[PDB]
Amino acid sequence: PDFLGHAENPLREEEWARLNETVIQVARRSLVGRRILDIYGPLGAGVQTVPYDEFQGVSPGAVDIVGEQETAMVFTDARKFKTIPIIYKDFLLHWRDIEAARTHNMPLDVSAAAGAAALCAQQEDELIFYGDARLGYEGLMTANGRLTVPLGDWTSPGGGFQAIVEATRKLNEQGHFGPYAVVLSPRLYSQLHRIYEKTGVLEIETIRQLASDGVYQSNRLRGESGVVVSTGRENMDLAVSMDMVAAYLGASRMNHPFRVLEALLLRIKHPDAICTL
Amino acid sequence: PDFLGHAENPLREEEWARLNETVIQVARRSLVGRRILDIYGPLGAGVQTVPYDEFQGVSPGAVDIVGEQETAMVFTDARKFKTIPIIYKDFLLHWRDIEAARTHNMPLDVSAAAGAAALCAQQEDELIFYGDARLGYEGLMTANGRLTVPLGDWTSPGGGFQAIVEATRKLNEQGHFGPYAVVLSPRLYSQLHRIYEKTGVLEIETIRQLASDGVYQSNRLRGESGVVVSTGRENMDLAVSMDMVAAYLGASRMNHPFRVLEALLLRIKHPDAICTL
Amino acid sequence: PDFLGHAENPLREEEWARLNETVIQVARRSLVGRRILDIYGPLGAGVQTVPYDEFQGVSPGAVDIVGEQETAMVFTDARKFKTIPIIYKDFLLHWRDIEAARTHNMPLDVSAAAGAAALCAQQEDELIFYGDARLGYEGLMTANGRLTVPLGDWTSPGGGFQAIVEATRKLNEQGHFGPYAVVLSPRLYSQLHRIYEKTGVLEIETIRQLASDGVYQSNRLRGESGVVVSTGRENMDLAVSMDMVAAYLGASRMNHPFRVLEALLLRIKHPDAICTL
Amino acid sequence: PDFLGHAENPLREEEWARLNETVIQVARRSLVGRRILDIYGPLGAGVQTVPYDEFQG
Amino acid sequence: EQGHFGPYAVVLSPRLYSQLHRIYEKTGVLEIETIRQLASDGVYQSNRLRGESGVVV
C-alpha cells in the first residue's frame, strides 16, 4: 500500500467518505452563483450536452371553451447543445501522510483538498458571470437583451438608488417580471453603503426590500458592476452534470494527485432578464 | 472513601457526568474564539502534533478536456508540526464536601470547577489572538501578510466606517475572498457605537451588514484593535486535541485537586486574510 | 499478451524478492554509519517524527531520605521531532528487457539498482556525519559540546596515540564516560596506520584496545576531520523509520522507474560525547 | 471512563521490566567504585545500619 | 573530485610492483600493507598491462 498501486483509492472508505464531505462543504459555502439561480437536476457524467434556446415571446390567453392560440409554444428556431465544460483545480497529497494515518493517527489531512475546491468553485463563478469565448459561451456580460441601460450614475451622496429602479422599470417592460436578484462588485457595494451624509439612512435597507429576492456580492464580476436578473425558472438554468467530487489523477510519484471535478453550465433561456451598467 | 484513595474518581458516575457537563457549558459560552472559526476534528490525546503550512498561491483554470495545470497543489515547502500546547487552570475540592454529598445531600458543588473553566477558556483566547513566543507560536497580531493597513482613523464623529472598507478592499485584493469576521477591543466598540451626532444612525447596523458573518468582542485583544479575517476553511483552522475535560491532579491533602485540560492550537494556513490596525 | 500495462510489479514475486535481497545486501556493505551506532526500533512509515532532546542537565544531591532537594530533571526543553527525511536515488528499468526475462532469460539484470542504493546509502552517511543547514539537523560536526582537541594524527611516530588519549581525557572529564568508538578519514587512517610503534606491535592494536568498541573508516567524513563518540545508547540513537527498499514510480511515457527509499535520522541526546579535530 | 492516571502502575509489566533493565545497564557501566572493592551482599531495606569499625594494629 | 568514490583496487605492471615492494618506507615497514589499506580491496599484478602504466578503479 506504500509500495504502490493501484486503484486502492489509497484512502479507506471512512477517509474517502470524509474527503467528499469536506469538499462539498467548502465549495457550497464559497459558491455565490448557485444561490441566485435554482439548480437543474444532475444529468450524470453520461451526457456531454445541455439544452439551449427558448422564449421570444410573450402573447397571453383570456379565455373560454375553444379559441385560444398562438402558441406553439416553440422551442425557438435553434439547436444543438454546446457541450458542458470540465473545469478543475487539482491537488496532491504527499508520500507518507495518508498511510501514516492508516497506522497511527485516525484523522486524515484534507488541507489541500478543500483548499483546491474553494479555489476551483471560485473560478467556476468567473466562468458564469463573465463571457468566456474560449469555449464560446454565454453568461451575463454577453447575454445582450439589455437594451444597454447605463445604470450607474452612482457617484457621491444623494443616492445611490435610481439605477435599480431604472432596472426594474426596463425589466418590467417587454413582458418579463419576477422576484429580482442584484449582483455587484464589492467596490460599488461599499461606495453605496457609505456617505450617509450623515442625515442619514442606509443603502442596503432600500435595495434589499426592492429586489425582494436578495442582494449578493461576487468578487469575480467586472470592476464596474453590474447585472440584475429575474430568478424565475425557464429564464436561466444552472445545468449541473456532476457536482463537486473527488477524482484521481491516480498516480504521480510516490504520492497521490487528486482533482475536484465540477461541470456546471449556465444557459440563458430568456435573455430579456439581463441588464448591465 | 474518606480515608483515602485511590482512583475512585472520588465522585460517583452521576456526579462525575455532571462535572463534565458543567465545565463544557460554562466554557463554550465564554469562548469567543471558537465562534469566529469552525473547529477541526478532535485529534485525541494520542497526537502531539498539528499540520502546519499552505497557500501562496492563487492561479485559476478555464477549461475543457486536457490542458489545465499549475497546480500542484503544493503543500508548501515547510514542516514539521509545532506541538499543540497544554493549557490548564486547576481547582481543588475540600475535605468533606463530596463525601458529605454521598451521604446526605444529592447535589454536588461545582462552584470551583466551572469557575476555573471560565478562567481557563478565557486565557485560551489570549493564547490565540496575541502572539506567544514562549512556545514560539502564531495567532493574529503576528501573522504578517497584513500589508500593515493602518486601519483606524477612528476618532470622534463622522464615522467610524472607513477602516472596515479599507480592510475589505485590501482583503479582496491579492485573491482571497469570503464572508468576513471582525474582532474588536470593547473600548473601540463603544467609542464607535457612540457620538451619533445625534443626526443620527448606528455603528453596529452598518458594520454587521458589511461583514456578513458577524462582529465579535474579545476582552483579550490588544487595547488598540483589531483584526479582520475570512472564515473560509483552509484559511485558518482551530485544531483541537482534547475538548474541555475534568482531570485529576489526583491527591493532595485530604482533598481533591482537579484540573481542566484544554489543548487548542490555531494554525494559519493562509496568512493573507489577516489585517491589523 | 503484454499488455501494457500499469498493473505491475513489473517483475513477478520471485524476481521482486531478488531485487529486494540484492539492494539491502549491497547497501549494508556500503553503510559505515549503522556499524558505529546500534539502531533504534523500526517505527514504520506511520510515524513522521522522532523525539529530540535531553541532559544539560545538573549533577548534585543526596542527604538522607527526604529531599534537600531536587530536581525536577528535564525536559529540556522544546519540541517537536524534526521529521525524519525520506532520501531517494532514482533509476529506471528500460522498456522490454524485463519481459524478455519473462520467457527468454532467467537472470533479470540490474541496470542501476544495486548501484543506486550504494550511491544513496553513502550519501545518507554524508548526511549523518556532516550537518545540514537545509532542514534542521544535528551532524557530528555541528553538535557543539565538541571541546575541539588541537587535532592529532601527526607524522612523528607518537601521532594518533596522543590524539585519542587526549580525546578520552576531556570526554571523561566532561563527566561522561563509557566504551568508545573512533571514526577517521581514510587518509588519516593510512597515515595513522602505524608504523610501528612502541616496538611491541602496531597502531591498530593500541587504538583498538584503547577505544575498545572498534575502529572505522568513512569516506564521507571531512578529509582533515575525525570524530570520537560513545556507542552507549540513551546517548545517541540512529532512528530508522523505513529501511532500504525498492519502490515503484509507476507507468511512465514508456519505462519502469524505481527509487530506493531510505529514512535515517540521528539524534544527539547527550551532545557531550562528540569530539572533532 | 479512561484517560488513566491516578494511577495504578501506569506503565505495564513489559514496559516496567524494560525500565529496570536499562537502569542497571547504565549504572553498572557508570560505577567505577564497585570495581576496586568487592561489594558486600545486599541486606534489603530492613537494615538501617552498616557494620563498623576498628583499626591501629 | 570527479564525484566518484568507493572501495579501490590497484593494478600495476609487475616491474612497478617490485620497485614498489620495496624496502622499508623509512617511517615505516612495507608498501604492501600501506597501499593495501588505502585501496583496501586489494593490490594485483598483471603482465599484460603496459610496463609504465598502472590503473586504479
Structural class of chain A: alpha+beta
Number of strands of chain A: 8
Largest interface: A-B, 50 and 46 residues
Proportion of beta-strand residues of chain A: 15-25%
Gap between N and C termini of chain A: 57 Å
Q: What fraction, in percent, of the residue positions of chain A are helical?
A: 10-25%
Keywords (chains A, B, C): Encapsulin nanocompartment, Ion transport, Iron, Iron storage, Iron transport, Transport
Family (chains A, B, C): Belongs to the encapsulin family. Family 1 subfamily.
Organism (chains A, B, C): Myxococcus xanthus (strain DK1622)
InterPro entries (chains A, B, C): ENCAP, Encapsulin_nc
What can you see in these coordinates?
Chain E: This is Type 1 encapsulin shell protein EncA. With 277 residues, chain A is an alpha+beta fold. Chain A has a domain at 159-230: hypothetical protein PF0899 fold (2-Layer Sandwich), CATH 3.30.2320. Chain A contains 6 helices and 8 strands; from the N terminus they run αβαααβααββββββ. Chain A has helices at 13-29, 97-101, 111-129, 162-172, 186-193, 203-211; strands at 87-93, 180-184, 212-217, 227-230, 236-240, 245-248, 256-262, 264-268. A 3-stranded antiparallel β-sheet of chain A has the order 1-7-6, covered by helices on one side. A 3-stranded mixed β-sheet of chain A has the order 3-2-4. In chain A, a hairpin with a 7-residue loop joins strand 6 (245-248) and strand 7 (256-262). Chains A and B meet through helix 1, strand 1, helix 3 and helix 5 of A and helix 4 and helix 6 of B.
